[PDB]
Each structure stands twice: as C-alpha cells, then as structure tokens.
Design a binder for this molecule. Structure first.
Ligand SMILES: COc1ccc2[nH]c(-c3ccccc3)c(CCNC(C)=O)c2c1
Ligand SMILES: [Zn+2]
Length: 448
C-alpha cells in the first residue's frame, strides 16, 4: 500500500471503532489499523525525504509507529475479552499520541497566508463586541420593566446565544490559529463545535419566534390580546432550546464534529453525512427563513396599506395608538383607526374621527420594534446565506461539487457567519430609541 492512503485508511478506521456497536466490530477495525500502521513504518515521509535512515529524521518516525502498534495491541486485548467501552477508550489515547507524531511526518495542506490574520482579527473584533454589546442588551432588558414586557424576553435568550460562543469556542479557535493546530483534546473539540451549533441554530429559531410574535401582535392584535403570555413566552423560550439540542444529537452518531484545518476551528463537517447536512440546511435555515419571510411580508403589506398606524388629532393634539385603543370609550386595544365607527370622537377635545390626520412616519420602535427586529433577521440571513449554500451543494453532489468548492470562498463564508455574533446589539442602538436610551443609562451608571 501507499503512505498518504495509509494515513487516510487507519484514520477512517479510527472513526469506525468509535461508532462501533460490538467488540468484534472494534477487533476487525483494529486489524485493518495494525497492518496499515506497519506498512506506513516501511515508507519514507515527505519531510525527511532527503534525510538519512539512521538519522533522527527517518529513525525519528520509526519508533513513533512502535508506540502506536503496541498501543493497538493493548486495545485489541480488551476487544478480545469483549470489553467494547474499555477498547474504545484506549483508542482515544491512541488518537492523542498519533496526532502529536503525524504533523511531524507530512505537510500536504497549504492555507493561504491571509486566513490566519483575517480569521483571528475577525474573531478578536467579534469576541470583544459580542461580550460587551450583548451584555448591555441583557442588563437593559432586565432593568427596564416596560421594555421586557414587550415580547423582548426573547432578546435575552438570543443575547446568551450570541454570548456563550465568545466565552468558549471563539477563544480556543484563536489559540488554534497561533499554534497552527488543535491545541486541545478531542473532548474540547466536539464540545466547542457543539456550543457553536446551539448558538447558530438557537439564534435562527429565536429570530423565528420573534417573527411569529410580531406577526400575531400586528395582524391578529385582537385575538392576540385574548391569548395570555405570562407563563407562555418562558415555555416557548425553553422549548426552542430543547428542539435545538435534539437537532444537534445526530452529530454523535454520524461523527460530523471534527477539526477543520481550512477554518482552523473544530466544527461541523458537511461531507460526514450528506443526509444530515441536507436536513441541517433546511431545518436550521431554508425553513425558518421561509416562515419568517411570510411573517414580515404580511406586516409590511399592512404598513404599506396604512393599517396599524397612529392618528394624531389636529385640534387638541391627542394621538391615537392602535396598540392601546381607547378602552374607556369602548374601543379595545388592537383596533385600527380605520376600524373605529364614524360616531367616535376625540377622548380629549370631542372632535370627530374626521379631523384626525395620520402619522406618515413608520419609526423602528413602533409595533413592538417590528422593523428593527426585521433588520436583525435580514443581517442573519446575509451572514449565513453563503455557508448554507456550500452545505447545499455538498449535500446534493459531493463527487462533483465538493472538490470544486474553493478554500478561499469557504473561509469567507465562515468569516461572515462568525461576525454575526457581535452585530445584533449594534442594530438595536442604531434604530431602537429605547435601547439606545438604556445603553446610555447603563454606561452613565457605570461612570458614577
Ligand atoms: C447541526 O450541527 C452543527 C454543529 C456545529 C455547528 N457549527 C456551525 C457554525 C458555527 C459558526 C459559524 C458557522 C457555522 C454550524 C452550522 C453548519 N451549517 C452548515 C450549513 O454547514 C453547526 C452545525
Ligand atoms: Zn383632540
């Protein structure tokens, strides 16, 4: 057999022993692993190609396999006895040592010089803005009682979803750039990769639940108010997080969470299972986008048709708000001005609904901050649109599309996706007046 193929063969068997269900499956895979490691010991590596045989260059990697095959021999002793959990454990100890004397053997891959600084600078920016920005968001929702009440409890759920990733995966990835490889165990590999899944998927579905809430608060305002919220919203916030965990469990059976040298981060592999990947691209993207687009489309047509707009009085200045109605005069909160009967008079001066001019301005803060929550979604779709397309190309034709996906393009997609984590609070401050106010209030309180 070859040497590069010998590296690819025993590395494939290393995935089989993991997903194996019995000791005979493990024993069989360790047989194909002992012979492949021995045939690699006969071959000459590319790094010590011009070096001498007795030299600690070619004789250096010779004892590396002696440590390896000996460890396999200890691992198949357990497998022979029937101990599957014991033999699979010793195989992970075979994995940690093998990676420490494999990077010393060959260097096939070639990362373009710009990935290391780009990725790291992006990560540094994102982590710094994510930790500060989404923390202010949490504090402002938790301190402001009127703000939190306006279905903005989902914003906390989303802020933590952004936050968690800045605290565990993002800093580890930055160590993996500076050390040119995964400096942590297989333990921290799949764990960091899993935290990323929760973040990315949890964010889509949180954005989805906000899209539904604002659809039902503007278009079904009457029926909406009939339906409680008190114990409702914490239940859906919990439910969406459990739905996410479930969506992420096939990764442990399909083995799609390993280190990606292209993006220097231990993440989800599109090739590992094209079926699961295809599902991930629908369930965690195409489907929420499809349902969220319907929701904001139905809002924008109502905003276009002049419905759910404020009507300011020409005489005393009283402003009608469809969100509040005029309940003491028999008009319920959620009733549009166009819907109040012609006999209605101003609750402050007494002039009829004939001398009431509408507010032409459709400010972001209006209708529970609908158009700013909209922007948040658009930005999400922009950042995650390329990667999900790359995932879609691979899920369909891996034989023709997968080797035709440029490395330089794949990095650009993960760069955008990583950048999303810090952006959400910035958009709140630029459009939403109340958040901006609260951001200022916190900073002012911190300097006094
Ligand atoms: C469901 O299993 C997981 C598990 C871990 C994952 N981590 C990421 C990800 C994190 C940051 C930036 C971009 C992608 C995805 C999203 C991966 N989506 C695609 C289409 O490849 C992910 C998925
Ligand atoms: Zn008036």
């Amino acid at each position: 057999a070859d040497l590069e193929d010998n590296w690819e063969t025993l590395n494939d068997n290393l995935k089989v022993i993991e997903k194996a269900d019995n000791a005979a499956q493990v024993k069989d895979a360790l047989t194909k692993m002992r012979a492949a490691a021995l045939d690699a010991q006969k071959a000459t590596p590319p790094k010590l190609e011009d070096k001498s045989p007795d030299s600690p260059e070619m004789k250096d990697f010779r004892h590396g396999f002696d440590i390896l095959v000996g460890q396999i021999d200890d691992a198949l002793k357990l497998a022979n006895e029937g101990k599957v959990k014991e033999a699979q454990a010793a195989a992970e100890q075979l994995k940690t040592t093998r990676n420490a004397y494999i990077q010393k053997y060959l260097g096939d891959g070639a990362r373009p010089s710009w990935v290391a600084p780009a990725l790291s600078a992006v990560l540094i920016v994102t982590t710094a803005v994510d930790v500060v920005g989404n923390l202010l968001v949490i504090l402002s929702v938790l301190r402001n009682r009127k703000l939190r009440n306006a279905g903005n409890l989902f914003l906390v759920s989303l802020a933590l979803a952004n936050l968690v990733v800045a605290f565990y995966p993002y800093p580890l990835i930055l160590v993996a750039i500076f050390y040119d490889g995964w400096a942590f165990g297989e333990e921290h590999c799949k764990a960091s990769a899993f935290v990323m899944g929760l973040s990315v998927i949890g964010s889509v579905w949180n954005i989805t639940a906000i899209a539904i809430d604002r659809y039902l608060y503007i278009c079904h305002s009457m029926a909406y108010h009939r339906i409680y919220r008190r114990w409702h919203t914490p239940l859906h916030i919990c439910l969406i997080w459990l739905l996410t965990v479930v969506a992420l469990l096939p990764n442990f059976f399909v083995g799609s969470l390993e280190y990606d040298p292209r993006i220097y981060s231990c993440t989800f592999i599109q090739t590992a299972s094209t079926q699961y990947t295809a599902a991930v691209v629908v369930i965690a993207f195409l489907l929420p986008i499809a349902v969220v687009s319907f929701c904001y489309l139905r809002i924008w047509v109502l905003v276009l048709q002049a419905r759910m707009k404020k009507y300011t009085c020409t005489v005393c200045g009283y402003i009608y708000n469809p969100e509040d109605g005029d309940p003491d005069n028999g008009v319920n909160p959620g009733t549009d001005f166009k819907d109040i009967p012609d006999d209605w008079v101003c609750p402050l001066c007494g002039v009829g609904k004939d001398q009431f001019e509408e507010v032409e301005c459709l400010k972001p803060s209006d209708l529970r901050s609908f158009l700013t929550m909209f922007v948040v979604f658009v930005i999400f779709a922009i950042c995650f649109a390329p990667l999900n397309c790359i995932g879609l190309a691979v899920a369909i034709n891996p034989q023709e599309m997968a080797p035709q996906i440029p490395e330089g393009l794949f990095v650009t997609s993960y760069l955008l996706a990583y950048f999303n984590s810090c952006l959400n609070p910035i958009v709140y401050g630029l459009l939403d007046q109340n958040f901006r106010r609260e951001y200022k209030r916190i900073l002012l309180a911190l300097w006094n």
